[PDB]
Ligand binder design. Structure first.
Ligand SMILES: NC(=O)C1=CN([C@@H]2O[C@H](COP(=O)(O)OP(=O)(O)OC[C@H]3O[C@@H](n4cnc5c(N)ncnc54)[C@H](OP(=O)(O)O)[C@@H]3O)[C@@H](O)[C@H]2O)C=CC1
Ligand SMILES: NC(=O)C1=CN([C@@H]2O[C@H](COP(=O)(O)OP(=O)(O)OC[C@H]3O[C@@H](n4cnc5c(N)ncnc54)[C@H](OP(=O)(O)O)[C@@H]3O)[C@@H](O)[C@H]2O)C=CC1
Ligand code: NA
Ligand code: NA
Lengths: 319, 319
């Protein structure tokens, strides 16, 4: 069952995705074929070798330097319209990608993504558009990366009401907090973190809780099918004592609160390193706990790859 | 999109499933109708009220008593051939129920079950049959009950190779071991558990690791698509120091081992009460930890209900 895919973005995640696709292009009797890849240097399109495109991108920074192959310069809208993949995969850092998704879904093309803002802000609209056009949208790696919290909430627990979710979903903050608690100061830990590439030059998205808040909104969308009415977002800047503190997202019907919270030493959310975790409390089950890596190339691409096979087999979108 | 369901068995689990179905019969624009229920007293078939049938079974022990219906004494095969449900739901303790599943799958009827031996011993044959007849088989509650380990392994991690799984899946042994660690002797720990309903008169399935072995076998099936070549099963009879000991199932390609293991106090497998836990190690993800309740009527019916919804919508059976 042959499917053509366009990959938009070719960063740490897209390249790691290429490796997984190359190794598993025929799985469950499906056949996955990447017809295009797109970065800021333009879009390559046709019968190129996936691994060569990955080699080229790694070694030169650009898909344009590709050998034996020609580069087109599609805007997002034109990529969709000209190449016409079965599935558009977004693994870029373009915040406004929703406009692109609207065009694909308008044409019946399913979208798979690791990119958070479009889903966090436009889920309802995107879902309506997908349903109208007989397509799907999948976003597993937007929350806890390849650890399958989205699958769990969206395709399982189908007879449950979700009372709440509490999750620690931002390893950058965890690193800072762990350092503060070890002796270092806020600014020094921020500085040590920049130096390791775990924070960016402007560290705000992590430190002020933005990333965590986007992810919580995605959890709230899946769980209740609507945006929250009460919202609180706080970062870790005022944290004085960091021992056993984590930046915790607390989601319940109509309400999201992201803020630092103290945890007993045996709480499942007291996660270290790259780990994330979620406690989902439902009516029939009580607490269900899921824990796994929340970041990294392969880790993230694992999730997008799952979503690919699901778009291909037309998994429904029940939530 | 309307579906008829035959519930086979009506014990703790089937009665809780009647409640969840009554609360959520029209969900995701599906419409669930229970057209038959079957216990050892016979099968009721028709327009009976679901909750009444539950009330009567609970008060009297038998489906016979319902006002205005008389049971039919159907063999499993006659049940299937006459009632012709779209989904057959097995929530019974009948070990050999695979014989009934063959009949149903033979007719295009999908099977949802919480009953372990058929899946543990016949998954291959059942899955082939389902595929040949355009049907699915779902078994979420055969392992860790409503905690969605089967969903996670079977429909997620689709780009992954499962290196191993370690899982504590039998709360009864946890209760015994916890008593032993508190001072009690084996035989008293046992007797106390009988008195509380946690073990049966023959407690062997729990104590000698059989339940856990079946569960390990199912996880192996889903992870590798074949039976294991080597098999080790040990119970808890010989345990002496029970402190922090749990009966642990270990799965990896071609093998399963069930045995008691001492565990460090921060190991996620060191669960208490009704809790179960699974640690799934994959190539891209490392350790993925899932934890939740492993037993209880509502808890087990929750997983069954999810499976009903997936059966209705024709979810694929990738693994
Ligand atoms: N890595 C991780 O741990 C995780 C990442 N994510 C998300 O997945 C996405 C990918 O992240 P990652 O691979 O790490 O990030 P990188 O910054 O490594 O990759 C970003 C990619 O997006 C491309 N890109 C950005 N804007 C555009 C545009 N406007 N047009 C065309 N191409 C564009 C970049 O192009 P170029 O190479 O040409 O600059 C680059 O190829 C992001 O949304 C991120 O938030 C989610 C969970 C975990
Ligand atoms: N309770 C739990 O926490 C869990 C249970 N399970 C499994 O789910 C299944 C149901 O468990 P549960 O509800 O607790 O068990 P119960 O012992 O409460 O119920 C068993 C039911 O199956 C019926 N049954 C047994 N044999 C036959 C037969 N030959 N024909 C018709 N009906 C039959 C019994 O009928 P009658 O009432 O007439 O005797 C009874 O209704 C079992 O396979 C169990 O292993 C799985 C995970 C967790
Ligand atoms: Na995820
Ligand atoms: Na389960």
């Amino acid at each position: 069952m042959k499917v053509n895919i366009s990959i938009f973005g070719f960063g740490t995640v897209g390249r790691a995705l290429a490796e997984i696709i190359a190794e598993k292009s025929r799985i469950f009797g499906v056949e996955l074929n990447v017809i295009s890849i797109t970065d800021r240097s333009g879009t390559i399109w046709g019968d190129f070798d996936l691994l060569e495109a990955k080699e080229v991108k790694e070694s030169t920074g650009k898909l344009s330097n590709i050998g034996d192959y020609e580069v087109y310069n599609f805007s997002p809208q034109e990529l969709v319209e000209e190449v016409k993949p079965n599935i558009l995969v977004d693994v870029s850092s373009w915040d406004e990608a929703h406009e692109m998704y609207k065009v694909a879904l308008g044409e019946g093309i399913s979208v798979v993504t690791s990119n958070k803002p479009p889903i966090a802000n436009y889920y309802d609209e995107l879902m309506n558009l997908a349903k109208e056009n007989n397509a799907g949208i999948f976003f597993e790696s937007t929350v806890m990366a390849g650890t399958p919290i989205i699958g769990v909430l969206r395709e399982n627990l189908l007879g449950e009401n979700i009372k709440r979710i509490d999750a620690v979903v931002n390893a950058s903050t965890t690193f800072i907090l762990t350092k503060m608690s070890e002796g270092k100061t806020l600014d020094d830990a921020i500085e040590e973190a920049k130096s390791l590439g775990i924070l960016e030059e402007d560290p705000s998205k992590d430190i002020d809780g933005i990333d965590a808040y986007y992810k919580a909104k995605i959890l709230h969308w899946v769980s209740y099918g609507e945006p929250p009415e009460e919202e609180e977002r706080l970062g870790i800047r005022e944290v004085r004592d960091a021992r056993n503190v984590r930046l915790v997202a607390q989601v319940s019907k109509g309400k999201i609160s992201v803020k630092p919270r103290k945890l007993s030493s045996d709480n499942p959310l007291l996660v270290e390193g790259v780990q994330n975790a979620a406690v989902i409390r439902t009516n029939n089950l009580g607490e269900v706990i899921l824990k796994g890596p929340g970041g990294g190339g392969r880790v993230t691409a694992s999730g997008v790859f799952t979503d690919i096979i699901k778009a291909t087999l037309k998994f429904p979108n029940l939530r």
